Amino acid sequence: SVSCQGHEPAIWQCKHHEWGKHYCNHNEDAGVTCSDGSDLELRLRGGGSRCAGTVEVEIQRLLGKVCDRGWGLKEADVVCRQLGCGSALKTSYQVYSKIQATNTWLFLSSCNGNETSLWDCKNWQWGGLTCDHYEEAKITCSAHREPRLVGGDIPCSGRVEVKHGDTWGSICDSDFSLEAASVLCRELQCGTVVSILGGAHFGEGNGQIWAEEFQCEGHESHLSLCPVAPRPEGTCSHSRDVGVVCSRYTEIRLVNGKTPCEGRVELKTLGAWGSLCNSHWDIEDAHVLCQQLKCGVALSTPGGARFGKGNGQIWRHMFHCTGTEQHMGDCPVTALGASLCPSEQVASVICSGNQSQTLSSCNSSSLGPTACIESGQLRLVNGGGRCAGRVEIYHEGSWGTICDDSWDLSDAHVVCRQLGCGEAINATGSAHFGEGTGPIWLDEMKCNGKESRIWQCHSHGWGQQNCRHKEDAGVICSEFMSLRLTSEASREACAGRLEVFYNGAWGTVGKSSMSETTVGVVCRQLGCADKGKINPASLDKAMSIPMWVDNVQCPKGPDTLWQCPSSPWEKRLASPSEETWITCDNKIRLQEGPTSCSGRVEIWHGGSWGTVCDDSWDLDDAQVVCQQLGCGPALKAFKEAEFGQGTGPIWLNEVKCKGNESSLWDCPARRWGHSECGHKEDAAVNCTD
Amino acid sequence: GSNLEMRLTRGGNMCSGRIEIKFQGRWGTVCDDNFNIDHASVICRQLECGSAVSFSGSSNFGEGSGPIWFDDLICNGNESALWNCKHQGWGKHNCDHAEDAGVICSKGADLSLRLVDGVTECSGRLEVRFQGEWGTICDDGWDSYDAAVACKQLGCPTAVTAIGRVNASKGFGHIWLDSVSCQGHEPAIWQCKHHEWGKHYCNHNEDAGVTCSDGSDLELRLRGGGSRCAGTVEVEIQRLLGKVCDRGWGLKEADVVCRQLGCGSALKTSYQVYSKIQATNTWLFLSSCNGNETSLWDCKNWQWGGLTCDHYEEAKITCSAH
Amino acid sequence: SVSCQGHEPAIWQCKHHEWGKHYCNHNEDAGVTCSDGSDLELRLRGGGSRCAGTVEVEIQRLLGKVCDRGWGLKEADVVCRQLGCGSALKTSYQVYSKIQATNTWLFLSSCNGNETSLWDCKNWQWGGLTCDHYEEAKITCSAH
């Protein structure tokens, strides 16, 4: 029990007990290890790289390990920081080799987590103790498998590349999957995954092609936390590089501001820098912009042009933000047919700059006629758009519906105007948009139509109702749009006239300024295919409906037509030579074959191409595939990847076609799921020319 | 040059371990990249130990990087020494991780094949001892030719060799071998061409297996019908009963069964149910028959167990002599 | 490893392992709770009546809950009978309101089912551990 302050000349000068009498045992004997600090080294061994494995220490040319008695993520962070491998993620790893056994151990008391090196942690013991009920300490830092995207114009699209040590290599499209894509867009903070594009869509890489597959479940926050399955080498070439498109494609910056936190809002689309205008720009949108830019919360949005107006370009996008979103790419945005706005009106925002503030809801709903988000939240569910669906309200930490009784247009007007959806066209009841789950918060609502919020209406009370779930209220608002392709044969098809449903009315789209990006967006939005072409006008036109919108220009990144800039809405009677007719490409494809009717079966669904597993594959199934492409009767139904390996996910599994189905979609099978089938089992067919 | 000497370290044996070369009086550990099976053969031939069965990257540590005298070498595999072939660098290297390239020569390697989880000795799963760990074999690429080599090596009757495991539920461990390609005359399984050790495209569910048998242990009969010429197909091999799954069941293969039973040609694939039949777990899978074979045992690549068919059902047949 | 029969005059008198420094890798520190039998109270909250909800235990004015390690209809029968609400039917309840959060927990070994009160079951532990893979104990008695 020697007690030394740290400046005594010798040990016996210190406080201690009587010489010769102690309760100690010879097992607990004291020693020291004095060092220049030259000989101390740290390593990770057995994990697949230098940033994963078992922590190995070598102090004065003696090898040891660290006992995990008090090992946590705070202590692991210091080691990963010391090695330069980023922050620690988990206290385990996936083994790749075997590491030799040593007898010596290193013991740690505790670390604050901000130390630069492990040797700076207080009271670490080298040897003198054995730990047998515990194991060694293992880490997996965040630089184990660092991903990146390259080769894309928009911020969150490009070629997938992962760093192995200090080199970057490409990935073949047979190894990537939809679950691994979710962990890659999420890790890079790019939101959800929109599409997977193989075959060197963004160009080819040079230097390395990693031969491994990530077995990701889909919820991991890093690619390092995901198991990796080694695969045979040389199975792919650089023409098979994989690429991804995530959902955060928006570019917003603040310019002409004295400080970086405040300035004039600017947006980049179609390759030009322009400024938004003040209409439909609110504090909720400004809160999200400041949070994304990491400035904090927005004090106010100056009117007029406080920071001036630069450049001739004006962008008329409208963002409908709740205020809780972290990125402007999460906010619903519509730019189709947006009205012109004067050059004087330009959006601005002045953020606090503290970066420490975090905002949340304040006070309560306060039912009754009359830096925090509103307590009551409104949303529309299951309507096919943001401006149609079943009305729901957030109260006491739950989402609840509104009773059909005494629900009319006057009650609907305040619902549509509060959400930024314009006026109300319909007020539907009796579960038109489906049955709801949860409490019925309101009943017998009576509104004059001039109110601001729904809780300002006269109602019986919060949760006081005699209703059932089959009578749930819904609205259809004025600013609600749907899209379809109309032909003579069918109202909805993959070829026909393009019609836009706006203000409760249908109408056509002008053909001028149509591009391949614009035609592709329509085909992907409707679910037909990935690309398309505009054919001349057909022989018959139905009802000669008036033209709604024109000059539609679609950038790269949107998957719906509502986000494409255009000219303002204008209902005009127009000749059939101006209306747009579009034919989409085939949803099924045969690839890697000597003849067009023989090859590997691919189907397009959910934004990306995919293959079909060969279990339950027969000739009757092959009959449908040859029928859909227009080929002749099938010769044989190949199995086990005869023609090659497939790209993308695996959509259809356990296919049982009756033999007379028009398309593979009508056949009963496991549809749009995550089966166990691998790409080695994709099916192929051969058809007569 | 002849001044260089190559030694193997950290493997526990002379013939297996990490490659070390002495240049200018210092040891060096060659980096793994550009390591072809030709160089593994040459290195095992330089030491005169034998052929090379594995070329593992071993501990690939950037820390403590040592200069490499023979890096990014290219060779045809016919030369007796590494320096004989064309060289890229001398004394240095441009390598990303991949340190301590190690080889495992055949003579120093200890490899064995055993059968386990079977009704008899010559039946069940196949396991391979690779460096002391027992590992399974992936069934992808398993045919009757690969079974014949395995039966000879295991010392079993080779009159009739059938793929598949009769009752082994699953295997635990590594999958050492995948896509074994034997011509049927090789002495051992590993002597044939296959994927690199450890690399596999499959799970532990599809483990390989053989059923070596001379004959008279497998009998075919029809049950549950009006007579012996109509009813469900029931097969019993080594006194283990089973039924045939109808994944590829047609009038061509059913004709072989009826002809084998002496019941004439095949009329229908169903029958009238007179009595019930007890259920059996194990299923017999056959790919396809030409209708010329005298018995089912003459059809190629018939697999006895190892897969399940939940969506399909048992095979049935009604012959003409009903 | 203190082993006593309940009649010894002190802890060191009854058979214990030895006097020495112990690591106790798997176990924790020992403690007791001595009571006259009046401070302990049991009640059910959040269920829409006194006979349904989440079992809330208050001992010496400390509010806590009961872990469901050994919770079953046989153990819940003691609680319903002790409260006087009949017999236990279901180990759940229909929610009517929200309940407070308490750090303390109660752990039960087993109850024969015929005990008059929960304070008569053998070897019940008041605090000292935590429940991470388990939840609170909820019952619905018959007289609900």
Ligand SMILES: *[C@@H]1O[C@H](CO)[C@@H](O)[C@H](O)[C@H]1NC(C)=O
């Ligand atoms: C780490 O944090 C502790 C606790 O706040 C503080 O005393 C110490 O100075 C910090 N060290 C460094 C290097 O910032």
Ligand SMILES: *[C@@H]1O[C@H](CO)[C@@H](O)[C@H](O)[C@H]1NC(C)=O
């Ligand atoms: C909405 O109201 C319009 C105008 O009366 C009517 O034609 C249409 O059928 C209504 N739709 C629904 C879904 O109620």
Ligand SMILES: *[C@@H]1O[C@H](CO)[C@@H](O)[C@H](O)[C@H]1NC(C)=O
């Ligand atoms: C399969 O059954 C046989 C007897 O028919 C038995 O010896 C063997 O152990 C069984 N296998 C398994 C994996 O249970």
Ligand SMILES: *[C@@H]1O[C@H](CO)[C@@H](O)[C@H](O)[C@H]1NC(C)=O
């Ligand atoms: C059956 O036909 C095949 C294919 O022509 C032929 O090779 C074989 O010899 C025939 N078998 C008999 C028993 O005639």
Ligand SMILES: *[C@@H]1O[C@H](CO)[C@@H](O)[C@H](O)[C@H]1NC(C)=O
């Ligand atoms: C409860 O039942 C058990 C088991 O039969 C019995 O030993 C015990 O004495 C009973 N308790 C009372 C208080 O009757």
Ligand SMILES: [Ca+2]
């Ligand atoms: Ca807004």
Ligand SMILES: [Ca+2]
């Ligand atoms: Ca009603």
Ligand SMILES: [Ca+2]
């Ligand atoms: Ca009303």
Ligand SMILES: [Ca+2]
């Ligand atoms: Ca009512």
Ligand SMILES: [Ca+2]
């Ligand atoms: Ca089928």
Ligand SMILES: [Ca+2]
């Ligand atoms: Ca297989």
Ligand SMILES: [Ca+2]
């Ligand atoms: Ca083979």
Ligand SMILES: [Ca+2]
């Ligand atoms: Ca005791």
